[PDB]
């Protein structure tokens with residue numbers, strides 16, 4: 128019945144039927160290919176309870192995406208340092224970007240969502256009016272023709288791939304509308320069930336809530352589709368303890384004011400109610 | 409359990425729990441959002457048996473994709489009329505392509521696989537060395553680094569969308585490797601369960617077999633993920649008759665010769681074995 132049981136079953140499935148694989152760095156993982164879960168967004172927000180999810184991070188990262196920013200320093204100054212390692216001088220130099228400034232992640236998510244097709248110079252350049260604004264295109268389509276089957280937002284850009292500090296995990300997401308409800312399916316090519324995935328679920332569940340607010344629709348379902356679903360070997364024991372835990376009722380997300388555009392959203396507009404996560408592992 | 413039961417249950421689920429939504433054609437559909445199925449490619453080929461599928465069509469269409477052709481007449485000259493209507497004078501005029509010559513479908517599938525990012529002129533143009541050859545990249549990645557989690561081939565191009573006579577249904581596909589087996593996951597944003605889906609399943613299964621042959625691996629699984637899965641109202645009755653029939657064993661696909669490249673593949677290299685379907689409806 129509870130939505131979190133689906134995630135727990137997926138983690139259990141990988142431990143149960145996964146194959147021993149390897150990484151880019153070489154650490155070792157248990158992996159399964161092709162998984163799908165469906166989380167209900169009706170009167171509840173999917174922020175996992177068996178293990179704490181960095182809420183401030185998902186909120187600040189998404190507002191940073193919408194802003195169209197590719198500067199990691201703009202997210203770091205907000206207290207969210209999850210992209211700092213990829214924007215460092217050392218990492219950018221190992222990829223061959225020496226003339227590039229520090230913090231410049233290349234044409235990642237934000238740039239693809241707002242300026243698809245545009246030529247990328249640097250993080251400080253003005254890209255207004257350049258490229259295809261997929262985000263606004265999504266919102267407008269939901270407002271004009273909700274039955275459309277092409278309401279898609281793609282971050283996977285083969286042409287811009289060599290320039291990105293890190294290739295997109297969330298390659299593509301599609302929206303759907305029935306009975307005044309807004310659903311969303313995410314295609315995640317690679318997902319770490321131990322840390323990344325629970326953060327990813329929350330992020331896109333928030334995106335769906337945001338767009339539903341602007342279009343006057345109600346949040347429906349969130350279909351999470353995975354490509355390479357893995358669990359790192361050094362996390363087998365902690366996750367074993369997490370599987371034994373009983374899920375607490377999912378919290379509730381509340382938007383405190385009526386906003387017209389997606390750009391007008393602020394941290395103060397969001398309120399999480401009833402989030403009681405289990406201790407640390 | 410037979411692999412075709414997954415497809416049949418999916419059709420049953422859409423008639424039972426689906427929603428009466430609308431279409432761009434305005435013909436009316438029964439729709440569901442977010443489905444997934446897994447078809448084993450180990451010593452068998454997922455060519456549906458409860459209804460005869462046009463094998464010549466899926467074979468000729470795929471070699472047409474690989475060739476990079478966007479000329480519908482180039483496919484028609486082989487007895488495969490599947491894209492004739494999309495390339496006809498009346499259809500091209502209605503979309504606003506009055507200057508385009510017959511058969512010019514625009515930057516469709518084949519162009520996106522071989523020349524992503526290239527500026528399209530027309531079907532009789534030379535695009536050699538232009539764009540990103542995604543197909544070649546996938547093959548080279550599987551050979552030199554099989555554990556990679558970015559083995560993706562994307563046909564969804566927001567920039568080229570308004571130029572396409574036929575919008576991409578199979579928007580993205582990913583490849584995966586374990587135990588010397590190649591698996592593929594396809595993200596179909598829109599799929600007509602009555603006609604298109606059975607054809608699409610065979611198409612990418614064949615592609616997996618093709619790439620697996622060149623890379624020296626064995627065909628693994630074909631994961632089919634759907635977005636807007638639908639059934640047209642006029643297809644309800646003939647599908648009710650298909651649900652009644654019992655699945656016969658899947659045929660086997662045999663590659664008659666050792667081919668080095670994806671471009672060296674020809675029709676004479678393939679032969680379907682043991683295909684005994686039910687009378688076409």
Ligand SMILES: Cc1nc(=O)c2cc(CN(C)c3ccc(C(=O)N[C@@H](CCC(=O)O)C(=O)O)s3)ccc2[nH]1
Nearest residue numbers: 179180181184207208209319321322323324326327
């Ligand atoms: C091996 C590996 N697995 C991952 O899932 C992963 C994910 C990201 C990006 N991502 C989408 C993240 C989600 C959550 C995060 C995290 O760092 N949570 C911490 C906060 C760290 C800080 O405050 O600096 C936490 O849970 O406390 S990071 C970057 C490297 C990775 N590396």
Ligand SMILES: Cc1nc(=O)c2cc(CN(C)c3ccc(C(=O)N[C@@H](CCC(=O)O)C(=O)O)s3)ccc2[nH]1
Nearest residue numbers: 462465487488489490491600603604605607608640
């Ligand atoms: C409403 C609609 N649904 C679809 O799925 C669809 C698919 C295509 C492209 N496609 C993926 C197709 C696969 C097979 C096909 C077909 O017409 N088969 C015929 C033979 C005609 C020929 O000789 O080419 C048959 O089964 O009799 S059409 C074109 C228009 C569509 N229109």
Ligand SMILES: O=c1ccn([C@H]2C[C@H](O)[C@@H](COP(=O)(O)O)O2)c(=O)[nH]1
Nearest residue numbers: 151294296317318319323324327557
């Ligand atoms: O939002 C994100 C970002 C990263 N990762 C994890 C998944 C992989 O373990 C790793 C990225 O490695 P590649 O898939 O790019 O090889 O980071 C996620 O799960 N979610």
Ligand SMILES: O=c1ccn([C@H]2C[C@H](O)[C@@H](COP(=O)(O)O)O2)c(=O)[nH]1
Nearest residue numbers: 276432575577598599600604605608
């Ligand atoms: O490979 C294909 C090509 C087309 N279609 C069908 C299903 C859709 O109903 C239709 C395309 O219409 P849109 O989804 O683009 O609106 O063609 C498929 O199912 N598979």
